[PDB]
Design an enzyme around this catalytic site. Structure first.
Site, PDB file in Angstrom:
ATOM      1  N   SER A 146       0.834  -1.215   0.000  1.00 25.19           N
ATOM      2  CA  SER A 146       0.000   0.000   0.000  1.00 25.19           C
ATOM      3  C   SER A 146       0.845   1.231   0.000  1.00 25.19           C
ATOM      4  CB  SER A 146      -0.877  -0.192   1.267  1.00 25.19           C
ATOM      5  OG  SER A 146      -1.916   0.791   1.169  1.00 25.19           O
ATOM      6  N   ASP A 201      -8.432  -4.045  -6.809  1.00 22.05           N
ATOM      7  CA  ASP A 201      -7.908  -3.272  -5.676  1.00 22.05           C
ATOM      8  C   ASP A 201      -8.016  -1.816  -6.119  1.00 22.05           C
ATOM      9  OD1 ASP A 201      -6.412  -2.008  -3.706  1.00 22.05           O
ATOM     10  OD2 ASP A 201      -4.605  -3.343  -3.905  1.00 22.05           O
ATOM     11  N   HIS A 258      -7.570  -5.146  -1.666  1.00 19.09           N
ATOM     12  CA  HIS A 258      -6.351  -4.510  -1.220  1.00 19.09           C
ATOM     13  C   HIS A 258      -5.648  -5.262  -0.086  1.00 19.09           C
ATOM     14  CE1 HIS A 258      -3.305  -1.356  -0.727  1.00 19.09           C
ATOM     15  NE2 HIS A 258      -3.731  -0.995   0.474  1.00 19.09           N
TER      16      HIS A 258
END
EC number: 3.1.1.3
Length: 269
Positions: A146, A201, A258
């Site tokens: 991320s 995602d 994600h």
């Protein structure tokens, strides 16, 4: 489809990235073992990786992670934690571009990611350099999930060309800069960037392309679902700057997509 060799590397760096989210991995003494609660990094623990340095909320933007020594795999691993609350930076408004002419000419990078890197670069460069000098045969790898993947990408671009290759493995990382930076990252000089993405995602679709953001090539897209195990047949290599066809498609995005990169990621406490 990818090789078994590359699949094994992708799995290993996903767990090193997952391990950055366990709080106890951000305040550990040098020389202790890296461990994860709830089986979040069984290959990391099997390699008997130890800390070189662990940091929590450093510099600007809460730079959090660790520097690890792995004698099974023969690696020096820098891992950055993404944020503690994903729904809050999809609200993010600091996607101003900043000049990063010191990395490449014409290149602009996200204000948040470059400032954060900048606040800890002095410390972390020293610390990577001291490790390289003591273990010269070991490969240096920067990873993260991320926003940690976005930090690992700008750290890798900044420190490459100092005598040692730097490979970067990023998982669900947001676009980091303009088209000139995406092109610079595609040449892959002084190490290789592996940009991994999962189905729909949402993070890899931000910040918006209309604000000047672009993605480097290639993309390794995971097509298998959320909570389903990945096989090397489920990953496809997508070529081209801002290629459509992997994660960059006009379908409905997802937040849970994600947190499933090989196993649960971003949920270690």
């Amino acid at each position: 489809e990818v090789s078994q060799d590359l699949f094994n590397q992708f799995n290993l760096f996903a767990q090193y990235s997952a391990a950055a989210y366990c709080g106890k991995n951000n305040d550990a003494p040098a020389g202790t073992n890296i461990t994860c609660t709830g089986n979040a990094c069984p290959e990391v623990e099997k390699a008997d990786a130890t800390f070189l340095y662990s940091f929590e909320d450093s510099g600007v933007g809460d730079v959090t992670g660790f520097l690890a020594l792995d004698n099974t795999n023969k690696l020096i691993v820098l891992s950055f934690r993404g944020s503690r609350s994903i729904e809050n930076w999809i609200g993010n408004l600091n996607f101003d571009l900043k000049e990063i002419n010191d990395i490449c000419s014409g290149c602009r990078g996200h204000d948040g990611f470059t400032s954060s890197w900048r606040s800890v670069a002095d410390t972390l460069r020293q610390k990577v350099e001291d490790a390289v000098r003591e273990h010269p045969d070991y490969r240096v790898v920067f990873t993260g999930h991320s926003l940690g993947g976005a930090l690992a990408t700008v750290a890798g671009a900044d420190l490459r060309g100092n005598g040692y290759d730097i490979d970067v493995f990023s998982y669900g990382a947001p676009r980091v800069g303009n088209r000139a930076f995406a092109e610079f990252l595609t040449v892959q000089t002084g190490g290789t960037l592996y940009r991994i993405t999962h189905t729909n995602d949402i993070v890899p679709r931000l910040p918006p392309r209309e604000f000047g953001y672009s993605h480097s090539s290639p993309e390794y897209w995971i097509k298998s679902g959320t909570l389903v195990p990945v096989t090397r047949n489920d990953i496809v290599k997508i070529e081209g700057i801002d290629a459509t066809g992997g994660n960059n498609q006009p379908n409905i995005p997802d937040i849970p997509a994600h947190l499933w990169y090989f196993g649960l990621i971003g949920t270690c406490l």
